[PDB]
Coordinates of C-alpha atoms and ligand atoms in Angstrom, one line a residue:
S1 CA 103.4 96.9 109.6
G2 CA 100.5 97.4 107.2
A3 CA 99.5 98.6 103.3
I4 CA 96.2 99.5 101.4
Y5 CA 96.0 97.6 98.0
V6 CA 93.6 99.6 95.5
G7 CA 93.6 98.8 91.6
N8 CA 97.5 98.3 90.5
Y9 CA 98.6 100.4 93.9
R10 CA 100.1 99.6 97.1
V11 CA 100.0 102.2 100.0
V12 CA 102.5 102.1 102.6
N13 CA 104.3 104.2 105.3
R14 CA 107.3 105.9 103.2
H15 CA 109.6 104.5 106.2
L16 CA 108.6 101.3 105.9
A17 CA 109.0 100.7 102.1
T18 CA 110.7 97.9 100.6
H19 CA 113.2 97.5 97.9
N20 CA 110.5 96.2 95.7
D21 CA 108.2 99.2 96.5
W22 CA 111.4 101.2 95.6
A23 CA 111.8 99.4 92.3
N24 CA 108.3 99.7 91.5
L25 CA 107.8 103.6 92.8
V26 CA 104.7 105.3 91.5
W27 CA 104.6 108.5 93.9
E28 CA 106.4 109.1 97.2
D29 CA 106.0 112.2 99.7
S30 CA 108.9 112.4 102.8
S31 CA 106.6 114.9 104.1
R32 CA 103.1 112.8 104.2
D33 CA 105.3 109.7 105.2
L34 CA 103.7 108.0 102.3
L35 CA 104.9 105.9 99.5
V36 CA 103.0 104.4 96.6
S37 CA 104.2 101.4 94.2
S38 CA 102.4 99.4 91.5
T39 CA 101.7 95.9 91.9
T40 CA 100.6 93.1 89.3
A41 CA 97.5 91.7 91.2
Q42 CA 94.6 94.1 91.2
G43 CA 93.4 95.6 94.8
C44 CA 89.8 95.9 96.0
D45 CA 89.9 98.1 99.2
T46 CA 87.5 101.0 98.4
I47 CA 89.1 104.9 99.4
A48 CA 86.7 106.7 101.3
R49 CA 86.3 110.6 99.7
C50 CA 84.4 112.7 102.2
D51 CA 85.5 114.7 105.2
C52 CA 84.3 112.4 108.3
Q53 CA 85.9 112.8 111.7
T54 CA 84.8 109.6 113.0
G55 CA 85.9 105.9 112.1
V56 CA 87.8 102.6 113.3
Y57 CA 91.4 101.8 113.3
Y58 CA 93.1 98.6 114.0
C59 CA 95.6 98.8 116.3
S60 CA 98.1 95.7 115.8
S61 CA 100.0 96.1 119.7
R62 CA 96.6 95.4 121.0
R63 CA 95.1 93.1 118.2
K64 CA 92.2 95.2 118.2
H65 CA 90.1 98.1 116.6
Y66 CA 89.1 101.5 118.3
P67 CA 86.7 103.5 117.2
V68 CA 87.9 107.1 117.3
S69 CA 87.0 110.9 116.6
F70 CA 89.8 112.6 114.7
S71 CA 91.2 115.8 113.3
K72 CA 91.1 117.3 110.1
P73 CA 94.1 116.6 107.6
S74 CA 97.0 119.5 108.5
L75 CA 100.5 120.1 109.1
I76 CA 101.3 118.7 112.8
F77 CA 104.8 118.6 114.2
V78 CA 106.6 115.4 114.5
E79 CA 109.6 114.4 116.7
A80 CA 112.5 113.4 115.4
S81 CA 113.2 109.6 114.4
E82 CA 115.7 107.3 112.8
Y83 CA 113.6 107.6 109.5
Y84 CA 113.1 111.6 109.6
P85 CA 114.7 114.8 111.2
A86 CA 112.1 117.0 113.4
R87 CA 109.5 118.1 110.8
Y88 CA 106.2 119.1 110.1
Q89 CA 104.3 116.4 108.6
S90 CA 101.4 117.4 106.3
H91 CA 98.1 115.6 105.7
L92 CA 97.9 114.1 109.5
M93 CA 95.1 113.7 111.5
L94 CA 95.3 113.3 115.3
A95 CA 92.8 110.8 117.6
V96 CA 93.2 110.0 121.4
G97 CA 94.3 106.2 121.1
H98 CA 97.1 104.0 121.6
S99 CA 99.6 103.5 119.3
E100 CA 103.3 102.3 119.4
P101 CA 105.8 102.7 116.6
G102 CA 105.2 99.2 115.1
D103 CA 101.4 100.0 114.6
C104 CA 102.0 102.3 111.5
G105 CA 100.4 100.8 108.7
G106 CA 96.9 100.0 110.4
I107 CA 93.9 101.2 108.3
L108 CA 91.7 103.8 109.4
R109 CA 88.1 103.0 107.9
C110 CA 84.8 105.2 108.0
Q111 CA 81.6 104.0 106.8
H112 CA 82.3 105.0 103.0
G113 CA 86.0 103.1 103.0
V114 CA 89.7 103.5 103.8
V115 CA 90.4 106.9 105.1
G116 CA 94.2 106.6 105.7
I117 CA 97.0 104.4 107.8
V118 CA 98.3 104.8 111.4
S119 CA 101.8 107.1 110.7
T120 CA 102.7 108.9 114.2
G121 CA 101.8 108.1 117.9
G122 CA 102.9 108.7 121.5
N123 CA 101.6 110.4 124.7
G124 CA 98.1 108.6 124.3
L125 CA 97.6 110.1 120.6
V126 CA 97.8 108.3 117.4
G127 CA 98.3 110.2 114.1
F128 CA 97.0 108.9 110.6
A129 CA 98.4 109.9 107.1
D130 CA 95.1 110.6 105.0
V131 CA 94.8 109.4 101.7
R132 CA 91.3 110.7 100.6
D133 CA 92.6 113.7 98.7
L134 CA 94.4 110.8 96.1
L135 CA 92.0 111.0 93.8
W136 CA 94.4 109.0 91.1
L137 CA 94.4 105.8 93.6
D138 CA 91.2 105.2 91.7
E139 CA 92.4 105.5 88.2
Ligands
LIG201 C1 103.0 105.0 115.7 O1 104.1 105.6 115.8 C2 104.5 105.7 117.4 C3 103.6 105.5 118.6 C4 104.3 105.9 119.8 C5 105.3 106.2 120.1 C6 105.8 106.5 121.6 F1 106.4 107.7 121.3 F2 105.0 106.6 122.2 F3 106.6 105.6 122.0 C7 105.9 106.6 118.8 C8 105.7 106.4 117.8 N1 106.7 106.7 116.4 C9 106.2 107.6 115.6 O2 105.4 108.5 115.6 N2 107.3 107.9 114.4 C10 108.5 107.1 114.4 C11 108.3 106.5 112.7 C12 108.5 107.6 112.0 C13 107.0 108.2 112.4 C14 106.5 109.8 111.0 N3 105.6 109.7 110.5 O3 107.7 110.7 111.2 C15 106.8 109.0 113.6
LIG202 ZN1 83.6 109.0 105.5

């Protein structure tokens, strides 16, 4: 679990979104596993605007942060789950690191700010849904 709070927006994994998230829907993209809902309270996370390939993510299944090198956002094949059939997920970045399903939502950050959130994993790899291209999150 986990979310990004920036301005009047809440960014979560689309497969973990709640009824309140869907009743206050701003945008969602199943191909990215992202959903953005509106909030009453103001958010203070800074979204990074860069092409960094190094950062640190929070791994709830170890209660620890890990430094990682990660790939550029791209279309990557993702195994079927109870949330989606087998498909290409877009804007996904992979790193070598530990992750379990409940780790989704953990933030990946670089020196510039929030890069994305844990969205996939398996086989000693962890995948992050990028949010750096969502320029509208700031306005
Ligand atoms: C952080 O996620 C995991 C981490 C590790 C493993 C394991 F196979 F090793 F057990 C599995 C997962 N689960 C996932 O990758 N997904 C299930 C939830 C929906 C995700 C999506 N974006 O389509 C895909
Ligand atoms: Zn950066």
